[PDB]
Amino acid sequence: GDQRFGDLVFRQLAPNVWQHTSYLDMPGFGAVASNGLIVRDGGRVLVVDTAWTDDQTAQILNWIKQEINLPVALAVVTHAHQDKMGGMDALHAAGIATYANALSNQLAPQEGMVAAQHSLTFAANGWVEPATAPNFGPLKVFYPGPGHTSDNITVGINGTDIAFGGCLIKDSKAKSLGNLGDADTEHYAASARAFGAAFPKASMIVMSHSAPDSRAAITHTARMADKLR
Ligand SMILES: COc1cc(C)cc2oc(=O)cc(CP(=O)(O)O)c12
Ligand SMILES: [Zn+2]
Ligand SMILES: [Zn+2]
């Protein structure tokens, strides 16, 4: 299932969909894995999230060149923290168009991130305003409300059973919601449930820090979040 490629790991989840995994030795927390996605849409490739670093993100592009060998049309990043946005410069060096929540781009400088080139905005119900996500193919971008951070966004893959929760969603056996230092404790539970309701047919839930799981990842994350209120 897992393919080791240098210091990174890649796993095919479905036809046209792979999970990328990178690791950073965070002092006091061990070597933390972070997951994103790679999607083939016809003759082009779409990326969800960078790796932790520019060098690791360049390695993602190298793997894409070896295993898919099609241009990367765009990347979308799911919030302004290092595990999701730390490799923005590598995407720009490669000529890839980059997208993030407008709020992520506003927060990026003070968070130590490089902003994406383009800003997504969202309707009151959470769905991306379509003009701000042009040519996204099967990617369906949804802002579920504040949770892990105020700017966290999520992505479904049309034509598959897959939806991606980023750092908002933890697996069905997770012991806690992890670092809540930037989190919205009042709204987390509703935001997790809003993600599940936005993608009701997704039976494979992908997330930043655990392997793909069933929808019990959503119910368990929300149930743990109920206790924050
Ligand atoms: C940004 O990421 C992290 C940073 C640091 C310094 C420690 C961490 O320790 C963990 O065990 C999990 C993460 C990922 P998270 O902040 O939950 O998105 C992590
Ligand atoms: Zn974060
Ligand atoms: Zn994370």
Closest CA to 207 of 175, 168, 153, 150: 168
DSSP per residue, 2-70: EEEETTEEEEEEETTEEEEEEEEEETTTEEEEEEEEEEEETTEEEEES--SSHHHHHHHHHHHHHHT-S
Fold assignment, 2-227: Metallo-beta-lactamase; Chain A (3.60.15)
10/27 Cα distance (integer angstroms): 25
112/60 Cα distance (integer angstroms): 21
115/59 Cα distance (integer angstroms): 20
Which of the listed residues 21, 25, 32, 170 should we mutate to test ligand 1's pocket, taking the one with most ligand atoms within 8 A of CB?
A: 32
Six-digit token string for 135: 């040519």
167 is in an annotated binding site: yes
Question: Of all atoms in ligand 1, which is nearest to the CA of residue 82?
Answer: 1
Contact between 171 and 210 under an 8 Å Cβ cutoff? The reply is yes
**What spacing in Å lies between the alpha carbon of 163 and ligand 2's midpoint?**
18
Which of the listed residues 21, 29, 164 should we mutate to test ligand 1's pocket, taking the one with most ligand atoms within 8 A of CB?
A: 29
Contacts of 201 (CB under 8 A, 6+ apart): 161
102/39 Cα distance (integer angstroms): 23
Question: Of all atoms in ligand 1, which is nearest to the CA of residue 29?
Answer: 9
Tell me phi and psi for residue 54, to 5 degrees: -60, -45
122/170 Cα distance (integer angstroms): 24
Structure resolution, Å: 1.3
**What spacing in Å lies between the alpha carbon of 75 and ligand 2's midpoint?**
18
Cα 124 to Cα 128, 164, 183, distances in angstroms: 9, 21, 20
SS3 for 134-185, per residue? CCCCCEEEECCCCCCCCCCCEEEECCCCEEECCCCCCCCCCCCCCCCCCCCC
- Do strands 44-48 and 118-120 pair parallel, antiparallel, or not at all (unpaired)? unpaired
123/89 Cα distance (integer angstroms): 29
Element (H, E) at 190: helix 188-198
Closest CA to 61 of 32, 22, 104: 22
92 is in an annotated binding site: no
* Sequence spans of domains, the chain: 2-227
CA angle 30, 7, 209 (to 5 degrees): 50
Experimental method: X-ray
Contacts of 46 (CB under 8 A, 6+ apart): 38, 39, 40, 72, 73, 74, 75, 76, 136, 137, 139
Strand partners, 9: 4, 21
- Do strands 17-26 and 30-41 pair parallel, antiparallel, or not at all (unpaired)? antiparallel
Among protein residues, the one with the nearest Cα to ligand 1's atom 13 is: 32
- Indicate the angle between helix axes 188-198 and 216-226, nearest 10 degrees: 160
129: left (phi over 0), alpha (psi -120 to 50) or beta: beta
119/123 Cα distance (integer angstroms): 14
Tell me phi and psi for residue 193, to 5 degrees: -65, -35
Question: What residues are neighbours of ligand 2 (ion), with CB under 5 Å?
Answer: 81, 167
